[PDB]
Design an enzyme around this catalytic site. Structure first.
Site, mmCIF file in Angstrom:
data_model
loop_
_atom_site.group_PDB
_atom_site.id
_atom_site.type_symbol
_atom_site.label_atom_id
_atom_site.label_comp_id
_atom_site.label_asym_id
_atom_site.label_seq_id
_atom_site.Cartn_x
_atom_site.Cartn_y
_atom_site.Cartn_z
ATOM 1 N N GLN A 86 35.296 -8.200 -24.800
ATOM 2 C CA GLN A 86 35.558 -7.238 -25.863
ATOM 3 C C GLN A 86 35.407 -7.895 -27.224
ATOM 4 O OE1 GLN A 86 39.507 -5.229 -26.040
ATOM 5 N NE2 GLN A 86 38.259 -3.492 -26.692
ATOM 6 N N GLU A 138 35.021 -3.136 -18.361
ATOM 7 C CA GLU A 138 35.848 -1.975 -18.669
ATOM 8 C C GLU A 138 34.991 -0.991 -19.452
ATOM 9 O OE1 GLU A 138 39.220 -2.804 -21.112
ATOM 10 O OE2 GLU A 138 40.107 -0.814 -20.884
ATOM 11 N N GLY A 156 39.420 -12.828 -18.488
ATOM 12 C CA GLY A 156 38.732 -13.059 -17.233
ATOM 13 C C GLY A 156 37.231 -12.895 -17.350
ATOM 14 N N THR A 157 36.778 -11.816 -17.990
ATOM 15 C CA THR A 157 35.341 -11.666 -18.164
ATOM 16 C C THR A 157 34.819 -12.465 -19.346
ATOM 17 O OG1 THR A 157 33.553 -10.069 -18.068
ATOM 18 C CG2 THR A 157 35.234 -9.707 -19.699
ATOM 19 N N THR A 210 47.716 -13.370 -27.579
ATOM 20 C CA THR A 210 48.163 -12.118 -27.001
ATOM 21 C C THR A 210 48.443 -12.218 -25.518
ATOM 22 O OG1 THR A 210 46.090 -11.115 -26.260
ATOM 23 C CG2 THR A 210 46.542 -11.130 -28.637
ATOM 24 N N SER A 249 34.923 -15.300 -25.991
ATOM 25 C CA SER A 249 36.221 -15.862 -26.332
ATOM 26 C C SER A 249 36.670 -16.828 -25.246
ATOM 27 C CB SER A 249 37.273 -14.771 -26.506
ATOM 28 O OG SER A 249 38.563 -15.341 -26.478
ATOM 29 N N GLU A 280 17.253 -27.864 -34.093
ATOM 30 C CA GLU A 280 17.598 -29.058 -34.868
ATOM 31 C C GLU A 280 19.084 -29.392 -34.819
ATOM 32 O OE1 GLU A 280 15.549 -30.939 -36.892
ATOM 33 O OE2 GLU A 280 13.677 -29.810 -36.711
ATOM 34 N N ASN A 283 41.469 -17.376 -34.934
ATOM 35 C CA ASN A 283 41.922 -16.120 -35.513
ATOM 36 C C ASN A 283 43.086 -16.317 -36.473
ATOM 37 O OD1 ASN A 283 43.578 -16.956 -33.512
ATOM 38 N ND2 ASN A 283 43.503 -15.055 -32.321
ATOM 39 N N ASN A 291 35.516 -9.571 -38.087
ATOM 40 C CA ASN A 291 34.166 -9.557 -37.549
ATOM 41 C C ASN A 291 33.103 -9.480 -38.634
ATOM 42 O OD1 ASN A 291 35.367 -9.623 -35.042
ATOM 43 N ND2 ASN A 291 35.287 -7.395 -34.798
HETATM 44 N N1 GTP Z 1 37.204 -11.586 -33.663
HETATM 45 C C1 GTP Z 1 37.769 -10.737 -32.814
HETATM 46 N N2 GTP Z 1 38.605 -11.207 -31.822
HETATM 47 C C2 GTP Z 1 39.185 -10.343 -30.958
HETATM 48 C C3 GTP Z 1 38.950 -8.989 -31.060
HETATM 49 N N3 GTP Z 1 39.644 -8.371 -30.089
HETATM 50 C C4 GTP Z 1 40.314 -9.297 -29.376
HETATM 51 N N4 GTP Z 1 40.040 -10.513 -29.913
HETATM 52 C C5 GTP Z 1 40.556 -11.782 -29.435
HETATM 53 O O1 GTP Z 1 40.274 -11.837 -28.064
HETATM 54 C C6 GTP Z 1 41.324 -12.469 -27.383
HETATM 55 C C7 GTP Z 1 41.461 -11.850 -26.009
HETATM 56 O O2 GTP Z 1 40.179 -11.531 -25.529
HETATM 57 P P1 GTP Z 1 40.056 -11.356 -23.950
HETATM 58 O O3 GTP Z 1 41.308 -11.932 -23.349
HETATM 59 O O4 GTP Z 1 38.805 -12.028 -23.463
HETATM 60 O O5 GTP Z 1 39.962 -9.785 -23.681
HETATM 61 P P2 GTP Z 1 38.553 -9.168 -23.258
HETATM 62 O O6 GTP Z 1 37.490 -9.580 -24.243
HETATM 63 O O7 GTP Z 1 38.710 -7.676 -23.147
HETATM 64 O O8 GTP Z 1 38.249 -9.738 -21.796
HETATM 65 P P3 GTP Z 1 38.683 -8.872 -20.523
HETATM 66 O O9 GTP Z 1 40.082 -8.367 -20.693
HETATM 67 O O10 GTP Z 1 38.565 -9.740 -19.309
HETATM 68 O O11 GTP Z 1 37.772 -7.691 -20.375
HETATM 69 C C8 GTP Z 1 42.566 -12.248 -28.207
HETATM 70 O O12 GTP Z 1 43.236 -13.476 -28.323
HETATM 71 C C9 GTP Z 1 42.063 -11.789 -29.556
HETATM 72 O O13 GTP Z 1 42.459 -12.698 -30.551
HETATM 73 C C10 GTP Z 1 38.112 -8.510 -32.047
HETATM 74 O O14 GTP Z 1 37.908 -7.307 -32.132
HETATM 75 N N5 GTP Z 1 37.522 -9.386 -32.929
HETATM 76 MG MG MG Z 2 39.137 -6.572 -21.392
#
Ligand code: GTP
Ligand code: MG
Ligand code: GTP
Ligand code: GDP
Ligand code: MG
Lengths: 426, 49, 427, 35, 63, 440
Positions: free
Chosen positions: C11, C61, C134-135, C169, C130, C244, C196, C218
């Site tokens: 996400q 998702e 999990g994904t 989180t 990130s 490079e 972040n 973003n």
């Molecule tokens: N820069 C940025 N970071 C984000 C955003 N949304 C969530 N994050 C960061 O993403 C982290 C969690 O991401 P994930 O745990 O991978 O959640 P996900 O991307 O939905 O992965 P899944 O739950 O497995 O589908 C959090 O610690 C947030 O700080 C966003 O919109 N922009």
């Molecule tokens: Mg997710």
């Protein structure tokens, strides 16, 4: 996609069940006829999670209403949002269990089990890919507590991958109706420590104490507590229905909350509860909202967290709302206290946020608590099972149908396994 | 309650010990810089060199 | 023909890629539904007059992809590119690695194949992700491993959100972060990272902005990525190809994790009063505030520093301000790097997003540091994992979904080897 | 634009609360009728 | 009976139902700043947290 | 390229710079928006603004000044006034909690949270300098920030910078009509932390400007806005020789070696001679000689101190307008040979004359008139030792019964610091008496 098939049990379920679809359907803009009269197109994209489409563009919920006296189905069908269900789903017996677990588990209930699985298995095969189920019930009686332990252990038999979630009203002794509430409740956890593994704990005593201080109500009728219960079962699956800036569905909340696989008894609580006299003067920001999640009186389970220590915390927010005020506020509460919140879990808060608030509010939240103080609710109901079972006060009402005296003792220490496991992690 | 009051008084004494040590370190660092600069200046020695 | 293929996973990946592709679409004259009323670095062209990005979007998702598929960019992409699973990975490295991603890894790799056969002069991939989920751990690990053993020695750049000290989180975030660092230690060419919490502090302090959302972060990450890859699209005094950085920044094949920042992050109401010259912005890059990853800078010494200047800039200003930075002897550069820096320049100035908050500035720098300071973050990210794994918290889900108890241990040791490797290359 | 939206939402919620006040006054008069 | 001043109590019952306000909460309060800006977050024990405004000759870390 | 950094402090420093910077936006063509207007922006032959104003690449001029106090209500009339968008907003430092008229509150308790912050904005302003001529402190001997924090700036500017000029402008508490009661505890405790770390410090009473306004400007009931126009005219006339060229150009670094005979006698007093209401400027000729004879009066001083009871150590006369220097040197021979104007017998030279070409300007609403030429005298007479025989007695009566001392010892100060800074002015009351004595 990620559907859920709803189920009820007993009188205490259907009053929460029929209040649930007065809330979910009003969040989706659906008339009691079932046809859509909403305003946004976003209200119908993930309507397939709970509902199903008939001909004519009419929607039927995926729910089955289960009871054992046919006066309870006439109560709910005649209601305002009650004619919505398919009438081939009200599955019931005729001879009542009558607050007898042994009837609703062994003799009377098990006559009806072969029928009730057909309407369960036909609404789950209509689904494409299941996520789980729902049971709304109590733990005091025998029509719904004992069928409820039947109806889960024969539904883990078939769909054991997909994650199931029940919602249980646990009976307090301070406001109690029947005499034998130890004899049904302290042993019905034998199939709720094992088979659901997602179960919530709501006390009717604490549900009153919300209604005297925060709400400050004069006459709390049983139609206003189930208002308060069905507006927090909705909140834990709003990420599963509606888009999120940071979302977490039903399965994601399981893998991050429970530290060890037999500690899954929860402490729900709704965040912005306010009285109708002090509504206007109250501020609606996020640091004001965390003032009210972590109370000892805005918690729906009658056990106090400061006599224990927190394991983990989730707080699903709602509304159009910022993201530093989610994260930095709940670091702050974790940092300034540091005593209730355990060591060896270096972060003790999970969080999530949707985009769409509940109808009529600028912002809300839903607090989920996992506390080690819940072992005083299990202590104070098993001591009341020591007293009546030493001199054998009421065992003949349930043993005319066949349970020897040690099946109560077998499920006593099986419940008393759970008291000590909170103790060793504290 | 009485044992928690004992630990409150303990941590107040620990707080005032660290606060005293913060005062002494602030004075020491400012006096060290003041005595360290006094012969000559900064970067104009380099330009002149 | 410096084409790059961009895959956004997680996400965090797709929600960054929304801002990134609105920035790239406004960069050229492309109206957002596709048509037009140098761009062949990221866009293929069809003879009706349509432009198609070189992008693949994936999550398990469906709602976060489907909001893109319904929103205002529905006609930008070939709508088979917006890959979508059925059951969520549920914050589970085992589920996004071993169990759930086995249905969709084949589809995303075949669409990667079709885009790389559309291309002709291929240079690299941009994988956005990130270290939280999990994904965002397992599926990215499978994607990188299969693309390494399939494509060869081509630059699979990855961009990583990084887990902050006191900001998270999830609860289980050390577990899947140390796992994805272990298994993606080898087959990514470089891994840029951002914090972040540090972006939150910069948003509070430099930009005068209180309570930022995720779009206000973003946008900054989009400006960073565009300042990385302006060299392939627009030509300048000293261009820098994307390959490079591989021979430039990283000295040893486990140290490919450089930090970044971007110096004229300034609102309009202050940049109207302040001029921002070249010496000003390159001195301003090296504050402990204005970096973008939380590590204490002064506790670490610098290894290398790749600056990218964008806009009106005359090379003597750069070449004087670099030595001005070097001679201070508190910005400690390591005694086996007398060269110090590496500088690039492009002519076309940084651009402006509608609905934006960064002020239009004539020149800008994005600097890519490689510090020794991030050993403290690896010490604390090993420590939180060690605190939880003393008594086996949260492990039984991942062991019911596909690893034994020892693989967390061997990832622990294969990550602690890196913390020893910094003390090795530090002393 | 954001200020205008927030003022409009505040007016909607205050109107709904006035509706709640009138409904509860009606219910109390119904109870007095029941006396 | 020309004038009438009776002791009304409807607000007193209306507020005194359920017991008075006693605070039962986890400890939440922010230690605020001293310099008044939206930036420039300086507390006594977390000083040096300001925006280091731009300098032509030397960076901030080498003052 | 020459430069000054006009750093203010105190609530009686922000109210001086409000009337000081409106003069310097009128000397140049600068609008309150900051941008130069259309007539002067095509040729650009004038670079006289570089002493005080910066210049950004987009054509906006931002002045070099930082405003400091702990009272957030006098800076917040600058962020909504006419000069909202002139000043850079990172140069208006402002504290939440007050100083509240205690020296010790403004040296040890509150001021340590801002001593680091203002010394980063100072380092910006002094970093653009090819050459720094000198700072300009505007403070007051009255209360917390203007007297306490000023001493904290002096012990940290000279440690940072060193042998660099730092002029100082300061009000002095009146003989009789003052507005505080804790005030003589401050003015004895701010001279002691200024005897070492300030190269020059001018002396002004607000009481003597209350006397010149009923007398010369013919204004009854003067407000505080009319006290900061007179002080704002002098600090123009001191620094005008940097910006606009002259016949005898006298810089800031010229003064501090040319007025002080001994290195703790840096307290010169100043005056501005041609202050005339616009009615009487129509009646009176204002030559170059007769506005030299009108500085040495017993009535046009600015400290309530008549120098008939003292010997003039030196003078530093600065002239501005249209003057010719045959006619300046005719008048200085009159004042030396006149019998009453006493000169110390180890100064047979005596004077220092400066000439500049710009006539003084007129602010709209200013009570002063457009006069063709104007002077500004600077002397450190012997007579100022009278005024310390008034303030140091007022410290002694209060400290005898130990009045008002319990706020200071509780606000982070030791009780001994009154004793050592009382004995320190037991030397300076003698140090003037040894050098006023005739030669032996
Ligand atoms: N820069 C940025 N970071 C984000 C955003 N949304 C969530 N994050 C960061 O993403 C982290 C969690 O991401 P994930 O745990 O991978 O959640 P996900 O991307 O939905 O992965 P899944 O739950 O497995 O589908 C959090 O610690 C947030 O700080 C966003 O919109 N922009
Ligand atoms: Mg997710
Ligand atoms: N000449 C002159 N004197 C002023 C002016 N404003 C205030 N004063 C005098 O200065 C003193 C004001 O107190 P200050 O010490 O300057 O106020 P401060 O510097 O902020 O100190 P605190 O009020 O304690 O915070 C009083 O003696 C006033 O008579 C002014 O505009 N011009
Ligand atoms: N929420 C709710 N709970 C109820 C209501 N009526 C009874 N209960 C609870 O139900 C418990 C008794 O269990 P019971 O309802 O008889 O189980 P049953 O046999 O399935 O009907 C009591 O402790 C009550 O607190 C109701 O209308 N709403
Ligand atoms: Mg004041």
């Amino acid at each position: 996609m990620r559907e859920i098939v709803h189920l009820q049990a007993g009188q205490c379920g259907n009053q929460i069940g029929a209040k649930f679809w007065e809330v979910i359907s009003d969040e989706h803009g659906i008339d009691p006829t079932g046809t859509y009269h909403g305003d946004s197109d976003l209200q119908l994209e993930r309507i397939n999670v709970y509902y199903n489409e008939a001909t004519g563009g009419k929607y039927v919920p995926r729910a089955v209403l289960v009871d054992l006296e046919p006066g309870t189905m006439d109560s709910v069908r005649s209601g305002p949002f009650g004619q919505i269900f398919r009438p081939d789903n009200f599955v019931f017996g005729q001879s009542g269990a009558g607050n007898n677990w042994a009837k609703g588990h062994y003799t009377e209930g098990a006559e009806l089990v072969d029928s009730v699985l057909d309407v369960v298995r036909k609404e789950a095969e209509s689904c494409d890919c299941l996520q789980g189920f729902q049971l709304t019930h109590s733990l005091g009686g025998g029509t719904g507590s004992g069928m409820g332990t039947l109806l889960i252990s024969k539904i883990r038999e078939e769909y054991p991958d997909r994650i199931m979630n029940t919602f249980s009203v646990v009976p307090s002794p301070k406001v109690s109706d029947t005499v034998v509430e130890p004899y049904n409740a302290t042993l019905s956890v034998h199939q709720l420590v094992e088979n659901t593994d997602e179960t919530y704990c709501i006390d009717n005593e604490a549900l009153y104490d919300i209604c005297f201080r925060t709400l400050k109500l004069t006459t709390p009728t049983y139609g206003d507590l189930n208002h308060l219960v069905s507006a927090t079962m909705s909140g834990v699956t709003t990420c599963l229905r509606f888009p999120g800036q940071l979302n977490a569905d039903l399965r994601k909340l399981a893998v991050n909350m429970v530290p060890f696989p037999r500690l899954h008894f929860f402490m729900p609580g709704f965040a912005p509860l306010t009285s109708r006299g002090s509504q206007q003067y109250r501020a609606l920001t996020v640091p004001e909202l965390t003032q009210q999640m972590f109370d000892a009186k805005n918690m729906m389970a009658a056990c106090d967290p400061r006599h224990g220590r927190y394991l983990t915390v989730a707080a699903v927010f709602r509304g159009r709302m910022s993201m530093k005020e989610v994260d930095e506020q709940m670091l702050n509460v974790q940092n300034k206290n540091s005593s209730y919140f355990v060591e060896w879990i270096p972060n003790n808060v999970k969080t999530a946020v949707c985009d769409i608030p509940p109808r009529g509010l600028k912002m809300s939240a839903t607090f989920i608590g996992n506390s080690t103080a819940i072992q005083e609710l299990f202590k104070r109901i098993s001591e009341q099972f020591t007293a009546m079972f030493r001199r054998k006060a009421f065992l003949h009402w349930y043993t005319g149908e066949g349970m020897d005296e040690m099946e109560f003792t077998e499920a006593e220490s099986n419940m008393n396994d759970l008291v000590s496991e909170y103790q060793q992690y504290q | 309650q009485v044992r928690v009051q004992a630990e409150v008084k303990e941590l107040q004494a620990q707080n005032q010990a660290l606060d005293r040590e913060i005062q002494e370190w602030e004075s020491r660092n400012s006096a060290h810089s003041k005595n360290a600069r006094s012969p000559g200046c900064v970067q104009h020695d380099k330009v002149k060199s | 023909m410096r084409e790059c293929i961009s895959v956004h996973v997680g996400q965090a990946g797709v929600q960054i890629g929304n801002a990134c592709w609105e920035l790239y679409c406004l960069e050229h004259g492309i109206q957002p539904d596709g048509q037009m009323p140098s761009f062949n670095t990221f866009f293929s062209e069809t003879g009706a007059g349509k432009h198609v990005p070189r992008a693949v979007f994936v999550d398990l998702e469906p709602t976060v992809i489907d909001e893109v598929r319904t929103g205002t960019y529905r006609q930008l992409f070939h709508p088979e590119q917006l890959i979508t699973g059925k059951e969520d990975a549920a914050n589970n490295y085992a589920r996004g690695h071993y169990t759930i991603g086995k249905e969709l890894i084949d589809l995303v790799l075949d669409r990667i194949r079709k885009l790389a056969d559309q291309c002709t002069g291929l240079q690299g991939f941009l994988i956005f992700h990130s270290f939280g989920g999990g994904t965002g751990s397992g599926f990215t690990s499978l994607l990188m491993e299969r693309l390494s053993v399939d494509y060869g020695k081509k630059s699979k750049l990855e961009f990583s959100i990084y887990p902050a000290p006191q900001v998270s989180t999830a609860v289980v975030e050390p577990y899947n972060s140390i796992l994805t660092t272990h298994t993606t230690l080898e087959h990514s060419d470089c891994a840029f990272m951002v914090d972040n919490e540090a972006i939150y502090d910069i948003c509070r302090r430099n930009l005068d902005i209180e309570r930022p959302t995720y779009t206000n972060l973003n946008r900054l990450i989009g400006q960073i990525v565009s300042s990385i890859t302006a060299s392939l699209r627009f030509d300048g005094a000293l261009n820098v190809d994307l390959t490079e950085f591989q021979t430039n920044l990283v000295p040893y094949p486990r140290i490919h994790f450089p930090l970044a920042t971007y110096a004229p992050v300034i609102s309009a109401e202050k940049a109207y009063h302040e001029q921002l010259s070249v010496a000003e912005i390159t001195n301003a890059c090296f504050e402990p505030a204005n970096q973008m990853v939380k590590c204490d800078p002064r506790h670490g010494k610098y290894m290398a520093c790749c600056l990218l200047y964008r806009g009106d800039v005359v090379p003597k200003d750069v070449n004087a301000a670099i030595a001005t930075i070097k001679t201070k002897r508190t910005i400690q550069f390591v005694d086996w790097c007398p060269t110090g820096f590496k500088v690039g320049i492009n002519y076309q100035p940084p651009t402006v997003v509608p609905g934006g908050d960064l002020a239009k500035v004539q020149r800008a720098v994005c600097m890519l540091s490689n510090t020794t300071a991030i050993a403290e973050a690896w010490a604390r990210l090993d420590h939180k994992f060690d605190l939880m794994y003393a008594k086996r918290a949260f492990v039984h889900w991942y062991v019911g979904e596909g690893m034994e108890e020892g693989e967390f241990s061997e990832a622990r040791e294969d990550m602690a080897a890196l913390e020893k490797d910094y003390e090795e290359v530090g002393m | 634009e954001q200020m205008k939206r927030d003022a409009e939402i505040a007016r909607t919620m205050m109107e709904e609360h006035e509706r709640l006040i009138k409904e509860e006054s009606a219910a109390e008069d119904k109870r007095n009728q029941a006396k | 009976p020309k004038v009438f001043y009776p002791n009304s109590y409807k607000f007193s019952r209306q507020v005194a139902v359920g017991g008075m306000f006693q605070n039962n909460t986890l400890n939440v309060y922010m230690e605020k700043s001293i310099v008044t800006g939206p930036d420039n977050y300086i507390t006594s024990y977390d000083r040096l947290n300001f925006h280091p405004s731009y300098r032509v000759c030397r960076p901030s870390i080498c003052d």
